[PDB]
Paper text:
Cyclodipeptide synthases (CDPS) are a family of [name] dependant enzymes that synthesise cyclic dipeptides using two aminoacylated [name] (aa-[name]) as substrates. Here, we investigated a CDPS from [name] ([name]), a cLL-synthesising enzyme that utilises Leu-tRNALeu as a substrate, and is predicted to be part of the biosynthetic machinery involved in pulcherrimin biosynthesis. The aminoacyl moiety of [name] is transferred onto the conserved active site serine residue (S33 in [name]), forming an aminoacyl-enzyme intermediate. This intermediate then reacts with a second aa-[name] to form a dipeptidyl-enzyme intermediate, which undergoes intramolecular cyclisation aided by a conserved tyrosine residue to form a cyclic dipeptide.
The crystal structure of full-length (residues 1–232) and S33A mutant enzymes was solved at a resolution of 1.69 Å and 1.78 Å, respectively (ESI†). [name] has a single domain with an αβ fold similar to other CDPS. The structure of CDPS is highly similar to [name]-BLIC (RMSD 0.88 Å, over 212 residues), AlbC (RMSD 2.25, over 212 residues) and Rv2275 (RMSD 2.00 Å, over 199 residues). A molecule of 1,2-hexanediol co-crystallised in the P1 binding pocket adjacent to the catalytic residues. Binding is facilitated by a hydrogen bond contact with the side chain carboxyl group of the catalytic Glu179 residue and other non-bonding contacts with P1 pocket residues. The aliphatic chain of 1,2-hexanediol molecule is projected deep into the P1 pocket, which is lined with mainly hydrophobic residues (L29, G31, L61, A63, F112, Phe182, F183, L197), ideal to accommodate a leucine substrate. However, the P2 pocket is far shallower and more solvent exposed. The P2 pocket is lined with a mixture of residues (R201, W203, K204, D148, S152, A149, R153), which is in keeping with the previously reported sequence homology that suggests the P2 pocket has conserved Met, Trp and Ala residues. The side chain of R153 is projected into the active site and makes a strong hydrogen-bond (distance = 2.6 Å) with the hydroxyl side chain of the catalytic serine residue, which is unknown for this class of enzymes. Moreover, the positioning of R153 makes it an ideal candidate to interact with the 5′-phosphate group of the aa-AMP moiety of [name] substrate.
Numbering used by the authors: 2 to 231
The structure:
């Protein structure tokens, strides 16, 4: 069915991302925790469309630092760790369903599943180094942290909360842990090239593609925005 093929309209981050997308080698589907967008139905739509378009499909779920997003919004570690385990199991279940429905390998990982992967660790070390040493990069990472906390303050119905620096620096551990997949997901996973796919623009990615940092995306890595249109 070709409503499936056209389920999404793709907006590439750069012309290189467009080339990688058109090669259709691999898509990495980013599933954000504690985000109402990722219902069972939407996860199925992502995977159905991906399965029709791409040679290889992988799903990326949140790793351990997802608890930091709750701990920063006033959640004690015990409750936060529980909510994470439950959210990740929900994402895995729905993703496994749709992959199996499409005859696809159950290729699902969290961003914590790569502590023994040299590419993930070296990119992560680069991210942490420039977070410490480049105030401009640090500022952009903290803005990603602010975005993550602000959207879940609305979602979890806590819109009255001041977002403090201590909140930002706690939640930015999540940002730093996920960033290696934005920068080098294809090489971490072992595909020739890949696009990470998400439904919102990546502002820091725009700056990276404008050559504003010593942090760079790998030449075989792209980013695409998935939009749905009538
Ligand atoms: C699993 C982390 C989610 C990644 C998405 O691109 C949103 O950050």
């Amino acid at each position: 069915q070709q409503v499936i093929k056209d389920l999404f309209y793709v907006v590439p981050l750069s012309r290189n991302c467009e080339k990688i997308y058109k090669n259709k080698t691999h898509i990495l589907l980013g599933i954000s925790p504690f985000n109402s967008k990722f219902s069972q139905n939407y996860i199925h739509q992502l995977i159905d469309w991906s399965s029709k378009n791409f040679k290889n499909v992988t799903v990326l779920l949140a790793g351990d630092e997802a608890k930091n997003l709750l701990e920063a919004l006033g959640t004690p570690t015990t409750k936060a760790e529980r909510k994470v385990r439950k959210e990740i199991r929900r994402h895995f279940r729905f993703s496994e369903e749709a992959l199996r429905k499409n005859g696809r390998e159950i290729d699902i990982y969290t961003f914590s599943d790569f502590k023994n992967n040299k590419i993930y660790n070296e990119v992560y070390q680069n991210v942490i180094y420039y977070f410490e040493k480049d105030e401009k990069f640090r500022k952009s990472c903290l803005a990603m942290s602010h975005d993550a906390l602000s959207s879940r303050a609305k979602s979890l119905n806590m819109e009255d909360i001041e977002i403090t620096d201590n909140m930002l620096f706690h939640a930015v551990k999540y940002v730093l842990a996920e960033l290696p997949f934005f920068l080098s997901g294809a090489s971490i996973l072992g595909y020739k090239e890949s696009v990470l796919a998400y439904h919102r623009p990546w502002k820091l990615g725009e700056k990276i593609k404008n050559s504003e940092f010593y942090i760079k995306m790998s030449d075989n890595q792209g980013y695409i925005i998935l939009k749905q249109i009538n």
